[PDB]
């Protein structure tokens, strides 16, 4: 498609809504 | 996670997101 012109927090916050069902599962942090 | 790789300049969307693009 075409995307949110956003860094960091604002990107992943938008992915919670825009990606509807599966958000932003990611690499762990220890 | 991917989010760092286009937080620097304009890019192709493959540098911005992997799953929601």
Swiss-Prot record, chain A:
This is Insulin B chain. It comes from Bos taurus.
């Amino acid at each position: 498609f075409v995307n949110q012109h956003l860094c960091g927090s604002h990107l992943v916050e938008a992915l919670y809504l825009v990606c509807g069902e599966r958000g932003f599962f990611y690499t762990p942090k220890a | 996670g991917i989010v760092e790789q286009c937080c620097a300049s304009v890019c192709s969307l493959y540098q911005l997101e992997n799953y929601c693009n």
